[PDB]
């Protein structure tokens, strides 16, 4: 069993599964303190609602939200959202790039601990338990975050739990991430080097794929084609198109490489860690959501002449596999 | 005639002796609820703190204000239990401190106006208590967002009465900018306590800023790491001036000419993650009377040094009412 929102699933309710998702993108604290921000709590609620729903008509069972504490996670709303669109949603514990002082000052051994209260106790007082660790770098790690890298893969060692990454992908991040990974022996199979459609550079990708990663593919509809006079939408999104980015999900597979894809959106319903209108903008650009991937990418691939059998091996099997804790060290 | 505090509306005159600038804890958006056995648990911190309350209230303290806000790990529902159980009114603080997360940091001036107006006309997150002070921050020169903090905190002041107090690196002289872009927006330096100010011995920056209608906050008088000069980070934090020198700038001040304009505090906690791991501990091994020192420890020296029970009253209890009634 994989843990979710609503309590412990079997392997096989998870179905088809988007590996890196977001509720809502913001910050510890400002949902509750600020939720005027994005209309109101349940204006938040009822975008994020239909957007699961839309994913769930086309295939979707299960995302995994990889918002961390500092990405402001709110796992009551998770749980609504997930309770009202039945849609599985796998939260997370970790660190990304906005740490508050109270925990940048913390130890690896103290990181270690929080990770672990949040796999095995639970998400504040919820009792809901993090079914994956969440970790960041952008460019050359920060000491830090290197204290973050070796706290997830202790915290990974002793729950069974994966670990997934953020990467500045053209800085080739993967490659330090592993090497920390390593140090700490954990398996690569239980890690995902995310952000990898971000960067063209395929052998950066087949090299840590050869070495048992597995490579996170998970912005394909990134992009701000149409948009170049917005600088703020450019520098998120980028100029690449999505059918660039969902070409290297057939390239990796074209090089032997299927079992180590994952897949996914990157998506929110909520942005509040970026400029006011992203929300918005994003949202013109893709009014599907969550479901590009199953309504867009997916009839790409396949008159591409990738198999549906593979797509199924890609987004069900793959997600299953990579969730699925593994025994404890 | 009112006051906002963690348990409703009180009346100038019910606040009485008033340490202005204090925290329950000391800590980040977030942290408490998602981290609480990083204080051993909410319980502990709860009981910690009513008892510490307690001890203040026998010494006299009616009212504290915390200073803490969003980014410092505010918990309005924190201070209202303490509040309750220890019958110590709280006032709480809207505004923000040194470390503000993404999704306040990208906020334009308008949008920053608009979250302390929430804060203190609406309510804190969904408890209804409302704040009755905004705090802000700079450490030396602000940095560009910190400007927008200083305006916002300006026009939500302008807008509702509530005052501004503000963290200081004093020895950097911040409050001379800081009233700066004050009266640029048009803030009445009477609505404004230029706080952490006997961090500094330069009396000359004080009278001056005094002399143009500040308050100046003595607020951290027991922090010291005398005694501690092997410890790197409580004495990077404490500093090396004894109490009895900041508490000697309260006297130098009153013996300047400005009683009315003066507010002392002991900037003290009861719980502490925003920096090393041992520091309550540390802190608490120094000041075991926590906020009674200022009753308990100031108030007599000061007295032995000549200064009137009359004086003392003015600043304890008069200062903070004239400065917490909004205008
Ligand atoms: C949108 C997404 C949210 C945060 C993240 O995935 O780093 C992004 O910025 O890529
Ligand atoms: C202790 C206190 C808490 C925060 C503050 O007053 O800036 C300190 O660090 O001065
Ligand atoms: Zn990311
Ligand atoms: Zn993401
Ligand atoms: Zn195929
Ligand atoms: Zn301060
Ligand atoms: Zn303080």
Redesign the pocket.
């Known amino acids: 069993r994989i843990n979710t929102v609503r309590g412990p699933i079997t392997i096989s309710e998870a179905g088809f599964t988007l590996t890196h998702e977001?509720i809502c993108?913001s910050s510890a604290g400002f949902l509750r303190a600020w939720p005027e921000f994005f209309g109101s709590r349940a204006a938040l609620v009822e975008k994020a609602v239909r957007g699961l729903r839309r994913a769930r008509a086309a295939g979707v069972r299960t995302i995994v939200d990889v918002s961390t504490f500092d990405?402001g996670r709110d796992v009551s709303l998770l749980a609504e959202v997930s309770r009202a669109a039945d849609v599985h949603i796998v939260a997370a514990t970790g660190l990304?790039e906005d740490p508050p002082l109270s925990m940048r000052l913390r130890s690896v051994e103290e990181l270690t601990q929080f990770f672990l209260r949040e796999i095995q106790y639970g998400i504040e007082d919820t009792g809901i338990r993090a079914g994956i660790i969440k970790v960041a770098t952008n460019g050359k790690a920060t000491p830090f975050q290197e204290l973050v890298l070796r706290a997830a893969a202790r915290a990974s060692l002793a729950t069974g739990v994966p670990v997934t990454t953020?990467t500045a992908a053209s800085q080739r991040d993967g490659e330090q991430q592993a090497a920390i990974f390593e140090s700490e022996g954990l398996s690569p199979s239980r890690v995902c080097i995310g952000?990898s459609d971000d960067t063209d550079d395929l052998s950066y990708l087949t090299a840590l794929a050869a070495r048992g990663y597995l490579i996170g593919l998970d912005?394909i509809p990134?992009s701000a084609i149409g948009l170049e006079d917005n600088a703020s939408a450019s520098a998120?999104l980028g100029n690449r198109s999505w059918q660039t980015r969902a070409l290297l999900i057939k390239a990796l597979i074209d090089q032997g490489y299927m079992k180590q894809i994952l897949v996914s959106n990157?998506w929110?319903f909520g942005?509040s860690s970026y400029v006011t209108n992203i929300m918005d903008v994003m949202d013109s650009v893709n009014p599907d959501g969550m479901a590009f991937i199953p309504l867009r990418v997916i009839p790409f691939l396949r008159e591409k002449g990738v198999s549906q059998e593979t797509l199924a091996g890609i987004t069900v099997t793959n997600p299953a596999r990579f969730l699925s804790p593994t025994l404890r060290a």
Request: aromatic content about 16%; cysteine-free.
């Open positions: 977001h993108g990405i990304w953020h952000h912005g990134h998120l990157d929110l942005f």
